[PDB]
JSON list of C-alpha atoms and ligand atoms in Angstrom, two decimals:
[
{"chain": "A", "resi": 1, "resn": "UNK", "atom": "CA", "xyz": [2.23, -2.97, 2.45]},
{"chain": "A", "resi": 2, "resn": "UNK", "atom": "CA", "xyz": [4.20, -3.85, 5.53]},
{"chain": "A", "resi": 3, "resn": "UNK", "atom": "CA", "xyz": [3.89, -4.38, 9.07]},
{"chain": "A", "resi": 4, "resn": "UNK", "atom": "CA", "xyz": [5.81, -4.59, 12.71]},
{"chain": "A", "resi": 5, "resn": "UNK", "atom": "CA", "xyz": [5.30, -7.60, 14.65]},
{"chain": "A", "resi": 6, "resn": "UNK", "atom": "CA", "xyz": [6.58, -7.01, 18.16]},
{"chain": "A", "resi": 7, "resn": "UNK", "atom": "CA", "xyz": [5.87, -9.53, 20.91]},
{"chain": "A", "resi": 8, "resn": "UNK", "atom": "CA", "xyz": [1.85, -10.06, 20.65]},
{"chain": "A", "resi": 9, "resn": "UNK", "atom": "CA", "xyz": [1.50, -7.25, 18.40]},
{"chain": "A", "resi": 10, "resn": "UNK", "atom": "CA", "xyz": [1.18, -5.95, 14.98]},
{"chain": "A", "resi": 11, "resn": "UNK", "atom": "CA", "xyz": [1.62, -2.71, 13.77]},
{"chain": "A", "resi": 12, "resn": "UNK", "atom": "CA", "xyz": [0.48, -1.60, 10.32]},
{"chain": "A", "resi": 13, "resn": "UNK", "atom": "CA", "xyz": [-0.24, 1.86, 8.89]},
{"chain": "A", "resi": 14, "resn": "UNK", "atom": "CA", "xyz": [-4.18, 2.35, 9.68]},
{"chain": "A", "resi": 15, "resn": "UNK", "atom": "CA", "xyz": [-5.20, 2.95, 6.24]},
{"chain": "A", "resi": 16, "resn": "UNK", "atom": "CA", "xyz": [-3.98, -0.53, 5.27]},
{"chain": "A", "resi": 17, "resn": "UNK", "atom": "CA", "xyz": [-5.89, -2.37, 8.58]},
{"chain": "A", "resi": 18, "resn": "UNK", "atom": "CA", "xyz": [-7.53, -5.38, 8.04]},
{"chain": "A", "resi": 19, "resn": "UNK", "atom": "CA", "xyz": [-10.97, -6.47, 9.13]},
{"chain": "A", "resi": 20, "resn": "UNK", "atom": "CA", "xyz": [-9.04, -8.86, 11.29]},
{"chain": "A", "resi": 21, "resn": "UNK", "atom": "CA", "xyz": [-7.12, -5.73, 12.57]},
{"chain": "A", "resi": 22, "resn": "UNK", "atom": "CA", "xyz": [-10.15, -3.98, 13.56]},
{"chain": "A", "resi": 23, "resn": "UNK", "atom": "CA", "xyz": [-11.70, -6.78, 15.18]},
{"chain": "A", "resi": 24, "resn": "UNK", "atom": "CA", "xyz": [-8.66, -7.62, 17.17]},
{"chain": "A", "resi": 25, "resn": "UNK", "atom": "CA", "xyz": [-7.50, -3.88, 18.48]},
{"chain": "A", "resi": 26, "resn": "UNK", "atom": "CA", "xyz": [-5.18, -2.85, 20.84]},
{"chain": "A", "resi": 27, "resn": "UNK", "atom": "CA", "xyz": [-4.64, 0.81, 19.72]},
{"chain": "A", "resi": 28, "resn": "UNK", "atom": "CA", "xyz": [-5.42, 3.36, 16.40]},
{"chain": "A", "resi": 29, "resn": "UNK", "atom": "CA", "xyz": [-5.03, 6.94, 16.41]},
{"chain": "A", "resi": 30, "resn": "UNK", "atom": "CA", "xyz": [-5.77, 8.12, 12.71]},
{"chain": "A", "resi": 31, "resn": "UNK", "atom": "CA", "xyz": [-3.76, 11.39, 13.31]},
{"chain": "A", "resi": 32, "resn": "UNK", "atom": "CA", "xyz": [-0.10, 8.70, 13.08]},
{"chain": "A", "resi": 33, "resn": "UNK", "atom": "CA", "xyz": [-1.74, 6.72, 10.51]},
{"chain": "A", "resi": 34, "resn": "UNK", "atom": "CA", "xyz": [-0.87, 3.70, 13.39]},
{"chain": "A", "resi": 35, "resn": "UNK", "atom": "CA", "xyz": [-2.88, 0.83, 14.52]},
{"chain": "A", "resi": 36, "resn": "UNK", "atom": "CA", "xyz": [-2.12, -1.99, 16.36]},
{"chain": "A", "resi": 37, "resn": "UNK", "atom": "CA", "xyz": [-3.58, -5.39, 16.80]},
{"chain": "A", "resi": 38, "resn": "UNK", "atom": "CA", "xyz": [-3.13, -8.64, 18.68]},
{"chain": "A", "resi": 39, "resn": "UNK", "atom": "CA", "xyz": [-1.09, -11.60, 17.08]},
{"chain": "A", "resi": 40, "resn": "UNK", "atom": "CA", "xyz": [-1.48, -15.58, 18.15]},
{"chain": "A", "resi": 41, "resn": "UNK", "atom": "CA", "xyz": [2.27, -16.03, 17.33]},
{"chain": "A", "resi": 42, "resn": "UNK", "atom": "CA", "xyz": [5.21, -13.97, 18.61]},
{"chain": "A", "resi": 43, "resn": "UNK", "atom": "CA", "xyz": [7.05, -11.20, 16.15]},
{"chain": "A", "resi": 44, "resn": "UNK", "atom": "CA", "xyz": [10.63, -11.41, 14.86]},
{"chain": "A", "resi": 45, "resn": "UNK", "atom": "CA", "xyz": [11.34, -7.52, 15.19]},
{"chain": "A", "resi": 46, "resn": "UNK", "atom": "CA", "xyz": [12.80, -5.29, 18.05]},
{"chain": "A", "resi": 47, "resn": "UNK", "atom": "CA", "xyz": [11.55, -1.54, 18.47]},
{"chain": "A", "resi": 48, "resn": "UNK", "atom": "CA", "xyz": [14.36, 1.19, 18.84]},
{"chain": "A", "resi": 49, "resn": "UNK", "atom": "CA", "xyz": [14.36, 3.16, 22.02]},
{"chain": "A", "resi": 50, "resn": "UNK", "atom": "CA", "xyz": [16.40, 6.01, 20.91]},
{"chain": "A", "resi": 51, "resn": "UNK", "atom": "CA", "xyz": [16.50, 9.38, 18.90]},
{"chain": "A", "resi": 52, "resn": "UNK", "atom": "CA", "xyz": [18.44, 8.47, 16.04]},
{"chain": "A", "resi": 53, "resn": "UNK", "atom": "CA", "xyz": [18.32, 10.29, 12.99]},
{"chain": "A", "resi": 54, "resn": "UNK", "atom": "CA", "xyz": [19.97, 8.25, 10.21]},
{"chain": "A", "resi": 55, "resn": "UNK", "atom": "CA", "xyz": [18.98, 4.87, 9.26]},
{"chain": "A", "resi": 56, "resn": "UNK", "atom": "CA", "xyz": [17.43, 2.29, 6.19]},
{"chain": "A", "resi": 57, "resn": "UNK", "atom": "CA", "xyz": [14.30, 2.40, 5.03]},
{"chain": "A", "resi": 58, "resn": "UNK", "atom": "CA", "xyz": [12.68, -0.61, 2.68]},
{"chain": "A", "resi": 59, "resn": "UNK", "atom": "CA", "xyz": [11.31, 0.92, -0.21]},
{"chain": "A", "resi": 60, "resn": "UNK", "atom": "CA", "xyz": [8.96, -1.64, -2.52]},
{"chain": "A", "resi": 61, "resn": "UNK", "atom": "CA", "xyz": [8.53, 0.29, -5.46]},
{"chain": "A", "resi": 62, "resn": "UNK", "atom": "CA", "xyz": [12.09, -0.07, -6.58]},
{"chain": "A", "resi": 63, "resn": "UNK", "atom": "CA", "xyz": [12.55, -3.26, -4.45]},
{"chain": "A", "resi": 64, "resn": "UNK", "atom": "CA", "xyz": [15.39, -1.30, -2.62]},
{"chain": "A", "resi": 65, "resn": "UNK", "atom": "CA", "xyz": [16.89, -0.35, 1.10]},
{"chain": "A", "resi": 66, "resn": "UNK", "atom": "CA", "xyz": [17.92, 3.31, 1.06]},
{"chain": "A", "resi": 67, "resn": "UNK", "atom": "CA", "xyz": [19.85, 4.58, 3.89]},
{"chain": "A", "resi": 68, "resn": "UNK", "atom": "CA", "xyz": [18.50, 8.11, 4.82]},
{"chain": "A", "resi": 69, "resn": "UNK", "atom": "CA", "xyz": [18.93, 11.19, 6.96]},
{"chain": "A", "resi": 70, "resn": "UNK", "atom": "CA", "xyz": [15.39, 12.05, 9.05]},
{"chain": "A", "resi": 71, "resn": "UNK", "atom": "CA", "xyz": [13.75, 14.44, 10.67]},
{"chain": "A", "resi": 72, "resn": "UNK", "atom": "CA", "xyz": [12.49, 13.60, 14.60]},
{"chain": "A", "resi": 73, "resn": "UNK", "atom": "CA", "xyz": [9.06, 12.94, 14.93]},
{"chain": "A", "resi": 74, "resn": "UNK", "atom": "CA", "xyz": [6.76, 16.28, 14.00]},
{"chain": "A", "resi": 75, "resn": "UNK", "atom": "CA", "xyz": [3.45, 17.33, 13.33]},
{"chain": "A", "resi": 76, "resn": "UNK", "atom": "CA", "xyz": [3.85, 17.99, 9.79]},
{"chain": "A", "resi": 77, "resn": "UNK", "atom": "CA", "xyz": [0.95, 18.75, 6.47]},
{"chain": "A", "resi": 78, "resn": "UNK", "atom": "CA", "xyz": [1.20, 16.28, 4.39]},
{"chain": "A", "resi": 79, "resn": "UNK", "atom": "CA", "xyz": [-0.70, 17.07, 0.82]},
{"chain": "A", "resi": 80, "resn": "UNK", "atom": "CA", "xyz": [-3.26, 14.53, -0.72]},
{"chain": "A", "resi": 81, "resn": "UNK", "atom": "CA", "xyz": [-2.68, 11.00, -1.18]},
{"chain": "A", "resi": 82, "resn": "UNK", "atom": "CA", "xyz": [-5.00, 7.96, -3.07]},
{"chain": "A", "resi": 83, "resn": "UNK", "atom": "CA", "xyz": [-5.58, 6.77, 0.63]},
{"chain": "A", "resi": 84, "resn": "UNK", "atom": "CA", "xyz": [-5.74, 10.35, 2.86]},
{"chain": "A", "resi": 85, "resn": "UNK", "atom": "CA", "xyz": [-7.16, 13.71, 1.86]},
{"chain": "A", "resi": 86, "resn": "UNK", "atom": "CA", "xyz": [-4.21, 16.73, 2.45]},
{"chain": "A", "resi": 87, "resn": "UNK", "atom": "CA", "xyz": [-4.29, 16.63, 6.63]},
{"chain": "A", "resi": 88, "resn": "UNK", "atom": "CA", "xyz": [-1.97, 17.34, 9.19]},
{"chain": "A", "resi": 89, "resn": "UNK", "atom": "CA", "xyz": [-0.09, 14.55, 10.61]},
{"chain": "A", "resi": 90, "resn": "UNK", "atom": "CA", "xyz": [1.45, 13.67, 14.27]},
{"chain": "A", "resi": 91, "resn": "UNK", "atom": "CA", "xyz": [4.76, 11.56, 14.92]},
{"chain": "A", "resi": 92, "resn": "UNK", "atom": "CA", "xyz": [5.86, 11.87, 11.32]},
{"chain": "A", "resi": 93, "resn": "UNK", "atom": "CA", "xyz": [9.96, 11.94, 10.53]},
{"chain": "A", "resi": 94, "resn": "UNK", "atom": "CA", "xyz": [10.82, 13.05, 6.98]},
{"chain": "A", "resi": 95, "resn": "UNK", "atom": "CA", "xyz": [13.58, 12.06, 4.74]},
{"chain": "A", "resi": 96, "resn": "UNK", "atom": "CA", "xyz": [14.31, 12.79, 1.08]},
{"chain": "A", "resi": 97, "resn": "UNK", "atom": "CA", "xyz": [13.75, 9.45, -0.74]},
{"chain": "A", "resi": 98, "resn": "UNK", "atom": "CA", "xyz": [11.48, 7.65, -3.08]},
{"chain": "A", "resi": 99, "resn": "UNK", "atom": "CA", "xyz": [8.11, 6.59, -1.51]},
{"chain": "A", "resi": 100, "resn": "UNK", "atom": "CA", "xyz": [4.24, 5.63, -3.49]},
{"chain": "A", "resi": 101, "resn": "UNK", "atom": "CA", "xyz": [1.24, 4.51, -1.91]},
{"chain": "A", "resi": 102, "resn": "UNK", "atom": "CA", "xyz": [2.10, 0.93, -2.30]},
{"chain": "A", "resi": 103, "resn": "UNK", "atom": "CA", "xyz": [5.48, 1.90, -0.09]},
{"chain": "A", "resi": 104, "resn": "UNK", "atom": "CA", "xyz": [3.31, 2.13, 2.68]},
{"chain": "A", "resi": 105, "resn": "UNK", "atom": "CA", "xyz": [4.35, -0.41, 5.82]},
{"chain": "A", "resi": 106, "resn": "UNK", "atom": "CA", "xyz": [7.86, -0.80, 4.59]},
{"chain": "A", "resi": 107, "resn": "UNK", "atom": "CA", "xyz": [10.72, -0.38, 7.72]},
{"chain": "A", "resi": 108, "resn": "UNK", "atom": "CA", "xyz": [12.74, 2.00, 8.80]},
{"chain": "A", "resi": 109, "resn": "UNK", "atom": "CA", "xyz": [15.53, 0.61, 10.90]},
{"chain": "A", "resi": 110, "resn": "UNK", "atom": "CA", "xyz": [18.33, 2.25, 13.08]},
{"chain": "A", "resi": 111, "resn": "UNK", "atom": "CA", "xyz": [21.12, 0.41, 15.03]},
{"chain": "A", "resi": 112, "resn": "UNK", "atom": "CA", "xyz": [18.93, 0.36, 17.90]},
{"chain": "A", "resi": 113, "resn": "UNK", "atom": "CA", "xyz": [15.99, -1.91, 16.21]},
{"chain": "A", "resi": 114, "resn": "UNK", "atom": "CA", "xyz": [13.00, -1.01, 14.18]},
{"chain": "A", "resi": 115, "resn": "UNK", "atom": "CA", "xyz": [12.32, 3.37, 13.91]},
{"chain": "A", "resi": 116, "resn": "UNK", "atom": "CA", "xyz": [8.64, 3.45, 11.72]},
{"chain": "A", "resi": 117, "resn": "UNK", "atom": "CA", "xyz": [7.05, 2.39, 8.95]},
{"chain": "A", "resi": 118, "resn": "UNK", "atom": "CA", "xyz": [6.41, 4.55, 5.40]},
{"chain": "A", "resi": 119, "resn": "UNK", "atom": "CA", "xyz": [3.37, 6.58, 5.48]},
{"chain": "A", "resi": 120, "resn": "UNK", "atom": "CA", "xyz": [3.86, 9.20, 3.40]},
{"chain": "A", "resi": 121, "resn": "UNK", "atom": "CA", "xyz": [5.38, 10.30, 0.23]},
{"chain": "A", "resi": 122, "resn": "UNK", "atom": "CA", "xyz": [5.52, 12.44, -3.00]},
{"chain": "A", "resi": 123, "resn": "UNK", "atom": "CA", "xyz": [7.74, 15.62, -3.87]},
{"chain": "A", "resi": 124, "resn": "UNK", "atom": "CA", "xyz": [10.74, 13.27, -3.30]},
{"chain": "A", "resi": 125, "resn": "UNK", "atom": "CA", "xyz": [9.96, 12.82, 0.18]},
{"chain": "A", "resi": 126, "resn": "UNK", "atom": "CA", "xyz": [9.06, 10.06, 2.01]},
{"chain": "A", "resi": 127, "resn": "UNK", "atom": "CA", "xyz": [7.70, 10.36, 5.15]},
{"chain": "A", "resi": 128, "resn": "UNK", "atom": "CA", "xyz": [7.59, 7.40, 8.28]},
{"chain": "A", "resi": 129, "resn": "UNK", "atom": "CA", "xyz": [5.54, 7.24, 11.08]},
{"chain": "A", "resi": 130, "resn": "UNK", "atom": "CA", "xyz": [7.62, 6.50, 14.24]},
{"chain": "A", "resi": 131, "resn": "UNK", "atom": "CA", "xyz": [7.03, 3.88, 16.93]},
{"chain": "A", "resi": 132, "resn": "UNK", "atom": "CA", "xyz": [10.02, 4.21, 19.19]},
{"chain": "A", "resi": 133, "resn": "UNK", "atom": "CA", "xyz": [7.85, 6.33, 21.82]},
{"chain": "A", "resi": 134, "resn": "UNK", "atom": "CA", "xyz": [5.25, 3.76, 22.20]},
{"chain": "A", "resi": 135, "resn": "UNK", "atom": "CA", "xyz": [7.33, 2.02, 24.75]},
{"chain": "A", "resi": 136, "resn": "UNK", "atom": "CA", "xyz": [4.12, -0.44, 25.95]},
{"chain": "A", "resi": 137, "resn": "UNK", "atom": "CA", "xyz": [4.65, -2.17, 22.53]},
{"chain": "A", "resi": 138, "resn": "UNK", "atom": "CA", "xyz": [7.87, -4.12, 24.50]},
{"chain": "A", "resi": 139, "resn": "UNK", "atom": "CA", "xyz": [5.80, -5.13, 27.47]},
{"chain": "A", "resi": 140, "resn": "UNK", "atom": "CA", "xyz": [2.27, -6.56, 28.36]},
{"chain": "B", "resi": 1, "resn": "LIG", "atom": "O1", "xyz": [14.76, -7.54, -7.95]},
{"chain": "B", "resi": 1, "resn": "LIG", "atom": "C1", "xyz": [14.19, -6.68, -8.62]},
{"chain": "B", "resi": 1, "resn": "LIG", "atom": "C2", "xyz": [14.59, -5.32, -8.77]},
{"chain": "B", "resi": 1, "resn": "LIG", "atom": "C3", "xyz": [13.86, -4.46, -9.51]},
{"chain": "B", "resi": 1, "resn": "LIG", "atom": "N1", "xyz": [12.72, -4.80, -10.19]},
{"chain": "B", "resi": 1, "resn": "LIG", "atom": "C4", "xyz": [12.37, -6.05, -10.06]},
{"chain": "B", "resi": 1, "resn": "LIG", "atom": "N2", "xyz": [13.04, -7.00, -9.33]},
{"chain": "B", "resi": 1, "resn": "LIG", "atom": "C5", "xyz": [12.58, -8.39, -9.33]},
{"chain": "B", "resi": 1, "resn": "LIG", "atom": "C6", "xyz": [11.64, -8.70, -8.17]},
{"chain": "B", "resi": 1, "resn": "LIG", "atom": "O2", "xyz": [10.69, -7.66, -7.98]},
{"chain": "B", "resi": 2, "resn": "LIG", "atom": "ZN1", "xyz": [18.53, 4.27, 16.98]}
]
């Protein structure tokens, strides 16, 4: 679990979106695993604007911060999971590290501000989806 509160806004992997979520919706796309909802109080994290490739990742299964090497953000297949079927993926950045189910939501970070949550993993990959192109998430 995990999310991204930015301004208004919260960001969570859609697989984990509550009914709340739902019924307050600013934005999903199922192909990022991404949606984002409204928020009544404002959000302690900054997004990165920027195309790093090395940051930290929070990973809950072993209650750690890894710092990791990643791809930029690719349509990539990604093979079955207990909460997706094996699919293609958009906006996905891979890095070799430990991620479950469970990892889902945790941050990756940058010097710049907040990169993507975990969305993926298995094979000794983990796999985030990236928010630093969504660039309306810093204004309205
Ligand atoms: O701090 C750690 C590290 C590894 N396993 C457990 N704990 C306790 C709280 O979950
Ligand atoms: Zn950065």
């Amino acid at each position: 679990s995990g999310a991204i509160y930015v301004g208004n806004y919260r960001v969570v992997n859609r697989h984990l979106a509550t009914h709340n979520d739902w019924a307050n919706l600013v934005w999903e796309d199922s192909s990022r695993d991404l949606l984002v909802s409204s928020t009544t109080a404002q959000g302690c994290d900054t997004i990165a604007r920027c195309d790093c490739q090395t940051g930290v990742y929070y990973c809950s299964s072993r209650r750690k911060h890894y710092p990791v090497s990643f791809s930029k953000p690719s349509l990539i297949f990604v093979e079955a999971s207990e909460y997706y079927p094996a699919r293609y993926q958009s906006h996905l950045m891979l890095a070799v590290g430990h991620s479950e189910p469970g990892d889902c939501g945790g941050i990756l970070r940058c010097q710049h501000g907040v990169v993507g949550i975990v969305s993926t993993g298995g094979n000794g990959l983990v796999g985030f989806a990236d928010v630093r192109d969504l660039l309306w998430l810093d204004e309205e």
